[PDB]
Amino acid sequence: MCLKLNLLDHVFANPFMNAAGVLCSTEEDLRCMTASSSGALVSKSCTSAPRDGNPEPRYMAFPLGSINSMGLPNLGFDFYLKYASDLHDYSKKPLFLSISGLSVEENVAMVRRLAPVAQEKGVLLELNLSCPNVPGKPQVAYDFEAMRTYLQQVSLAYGLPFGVKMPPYFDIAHFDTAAAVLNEFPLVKFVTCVNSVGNGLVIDAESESVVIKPKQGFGGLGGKYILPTALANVNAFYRRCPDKLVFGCGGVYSGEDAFLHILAGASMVQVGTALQEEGPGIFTRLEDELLEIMARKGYRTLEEFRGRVKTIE
Amino acid sequence: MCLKLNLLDHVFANPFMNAAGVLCSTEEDLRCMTASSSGALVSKSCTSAPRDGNPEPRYMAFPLGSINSMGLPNLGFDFYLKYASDLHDYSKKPLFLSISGLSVEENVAMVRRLAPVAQEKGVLLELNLSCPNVPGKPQVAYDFEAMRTYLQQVSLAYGLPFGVKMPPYFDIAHFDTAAAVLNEFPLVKFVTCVNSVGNGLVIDAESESVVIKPKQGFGGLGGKYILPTALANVNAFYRRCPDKLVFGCGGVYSGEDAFLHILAGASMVQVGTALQEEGPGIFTRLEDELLEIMARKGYRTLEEFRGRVKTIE
Ligand SMILES: Cc1cc2nc3c(=O)[nH]c(=O)nc-3n(C[C@H](O)[C@H](O)[C@H](O)COP(=O)(O)O)c2cc1C
Numbered sequence: 001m002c003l004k005l006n007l008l009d010h011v012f013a014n015p016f017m018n019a020a021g022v023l024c025s026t027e028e029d030l031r032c033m034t035a036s037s038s039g040a041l042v043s044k045s046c047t048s049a050p051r052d053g054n055p056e057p058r059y060m061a062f063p064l065g066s067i068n069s070m071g072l073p074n075l076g077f078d079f080y081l082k083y084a085s086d087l088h089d090y091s092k093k094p095l096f097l098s099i100s101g102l103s104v105e106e107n108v109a110m111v112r113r114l115a116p117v118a119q120e121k122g123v124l125l126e127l128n129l130s131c132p133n134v135p136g137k138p139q140v141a142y143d144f145e146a147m148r149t150y151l152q153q154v155s156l157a158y159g160l161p162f163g164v165k166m167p168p169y170f171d172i173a174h175f176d177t178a179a180a181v182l183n184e185f186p187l188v189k190f191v192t193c194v195n196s197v198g199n200g201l202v203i204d205a206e207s208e209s210v211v212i213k214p215k216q217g218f219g220g221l222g223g224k225y226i227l228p229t230a231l232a233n234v235n236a237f238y239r240r241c242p243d244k245l246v247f248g249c250g251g252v253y254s255g256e257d258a259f260l261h262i263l264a265g266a267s268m269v270q271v272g273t274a275l276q277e278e279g280p281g282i283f284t285r286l287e288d289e290l291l292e293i294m295a296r297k298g299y300r301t302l303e304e305f306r307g308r309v310k311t312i313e
Numbered sequence: 314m315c316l317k318l319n320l321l322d323h324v325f326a327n328p329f330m331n332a333a334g335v336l337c338s339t340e341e342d343l344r345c346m347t348a349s350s351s352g353a354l355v356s357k358s359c360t361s362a363p364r365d366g367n368p369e370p371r372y373m374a375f376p377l378g379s380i381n382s383m384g385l386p387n388l389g390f391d392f393y394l395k396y397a398s399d400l401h402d403y404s405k406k407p408l409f410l411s412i413s414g415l416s417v418e419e420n421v422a423m424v425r426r427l428a429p430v431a432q433e434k435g436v437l438l439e440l441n442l443s444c445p446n447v448p449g450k451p452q453v454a455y456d457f458e459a460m461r462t463y464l465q466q467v468s469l470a471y472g473l474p475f476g477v478k479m480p481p482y483f484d485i486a487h488f489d490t491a492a493a494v495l496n497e498f499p500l501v502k503f504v505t506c507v508n509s510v511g512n513g514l515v516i517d518a519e520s521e522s523v524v525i526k527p528k529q530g531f532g533g534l535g536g537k538y539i540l541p542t543a544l545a546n547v548n549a550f551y552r553r554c555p556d557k558l559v560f561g562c563g564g565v566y567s568g569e570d571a572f573l574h575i576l577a578g579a580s581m582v583q584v585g586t587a588l589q590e591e592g593p594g595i596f597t598r599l600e601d602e603l604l605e606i607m608a609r610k611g612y613r614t615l616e617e618f619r620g621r622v623k624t625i626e
Pocket residue numbers: 019020021022044045059066068070072098100128165194195196221222223224226249250251252270271272273274276
């Protein structure tokens with residue numbers, strides 16, 4: 001009975017990893033994820049220049065999840081490239097590097113320079129298609145023409161297999177159109193579903209106030225609020241992208257949550273809000289919990305149930 | 314101390330009503346909602362002809378909320394009109410009638426017949442913009458050009474103040490675009506935010522199956538999962554539509570939850586999943602709980618705090 005996976009020409013002890021942005025912004029953070037029982041880690045979505053990000057408070061958590069408008073605080077690309085190139089111990093586990101340029105040219109410039117490092121060290125690119133667009137236009141992945149442009153340019157500039165981090169969709173026609181766009185790009189080998197459920201608003205009843213300062217308190221939601229939305233997007237893309245892998249992300253707090261993601265079609269399973277709250281010890285528990293569910297059901301490997309969610313009649 | 318208010322030329326005992334489609338499909342349902350301590354009631358969204366809806370199971374609820382793919386089962390428009398015109402006791406509370414035709418023409422035909430009943434009896438129209446659209450196309454509210462046409466045609470056909478039931482949005486540009494569409498129509502006097510969070514997926518770990526039969530288990534989410542989404546949409550439209558009312562719907566299970574919708578800007582507060590689960594006694598609890606929070610805060614009116622959610626500097 002085991003949680004090992006072999007994909008994208010890498011080997012993973014188990015399917016768990018952090019979600020981008022959680023426990024992955026500094027060298028300390030990355031070493032801490034490396035030391036954890038996770039099967040992999042991803043770096044904070046970066047920009048070419050370092051960023052301080054939005055005013056605080058910009059992240060808050062509650063029993064059912066979290067809200068944030070961090071604003072891409074990050075140490076800049078050169079720092080993440082250097083971590084990939086010179087500091088990361090690939091004998092411990094694989095590394096994903098997440099990029100989130102504020103324009104298509106910014107992304108092209110980073111992926112050109114990531115390429116030789118990816119080829120020589122085996123760092124894996126996750127391109128974040130919630131990067132903001134032009135303000136007053138929707139985020140990139142909710143503008144199918146911009147998304148196409150981003151993927152064509154990044155495909156040309158990088159030339160290597162990569163993956164994409166997708167926001168959630170809520171309309172079947174969007175599932176259809178988005179997967180069709182992704183399916184135009186053979187170098188897109190994995191699809192991470194989902195980023196935060198955008199622009200929610202948490203209000204504290206006692207103080208009568210929003211709980212985060214940017215954007216009049218509007219920000220992306222994560223945690224228990226979003227697990228069925230995440231499961232839906234994992235399975236939508238699993239069913240529509242048969243030549244790509246799907247990584248699941250959203251609402252994982254337990255081995256059972258991870259099991260559902262994997263039944264929906266998840267290969268890797270990322271952990272955001274729960275990891276933020278509990279810390280990297282969450283990885284041993286998730287592993288133990290998922291293995292206990294597998295033992296009770298008689299499953300010996302992940303492939304025996306991945307994507308095998310049953311429908312009714 | 315009482316929760317009474319006046320909106321749209323009607324008087325309401327309190328701000329609570331059912332959400333469309335919950336406890337409101339049959340004559341028995343409507344009389345039950347009428348007998349409740351709700352302030353108003355809304356009928357099941359209807360089509361010209363009666364419909365059986367989708368195969369069962371088509372609704373399921375859980376600790377954090379519900380999923381449904383009901384498929385617009387309804388007794389057809391002649392039945393709801395007849396209810397509005399001959400059966401409803403307007404001395405008890407106002408009535409809203411929800412229409413959800415599958416085309417623009419269907420909606421026009423229903424509203425032309427509704428108008429003289431609205432004039433004579435004061436029944437209010439809630440137009441459901443989570444309706445069918447043209448080939449491989451998103452729901453109407455997610456296709457701003459179709460939304461505009463629907464509203465143009467309905468405003469011309471109906472000629473009287475009405476409201477619209479909106480699906481949630483997740484992107485600030487979308488809020489900007491949707492509110493601008495709506496503000497083109499002076500007869501659109503209220504905006505109900507929000508319908509269910511579309512196309513989530515609930516999976517049962519023990520059976521390894523989805524929990525509803527239609528659409529391979531995909532359906533609209535309600536309940537706790539959607540409260541911060543619902544508050545965000547209420548506030549966004551409250552901010553953008555200063556000459557309209559906003560009705561809040563989504564995740565209300567307590568007077569606290571209702572308090573947060575009213576702080577966000579809600580005039581009326583609709584109850585879906587929690588009503589489906591608890592039954593119509595919920596209305597007395599919600600009234601009591603809301604009055605209790607008001608008392609503790611020293612608020613005597615809803616107007617003192619509606620839309621007064623505080624931001625951080
Ligand atoms: C504090 C915080 C920072 C995040 N930053 C990023 C990021 O830099 N890039 C990215 O793709 N997603 C980011 N996300 C989204 C998470 O990766 C994840 O998609 C989302 O939180 C849902 O997973 P969850 O329900 O486990 O939180 C961030 C989330 C949180 C809470």
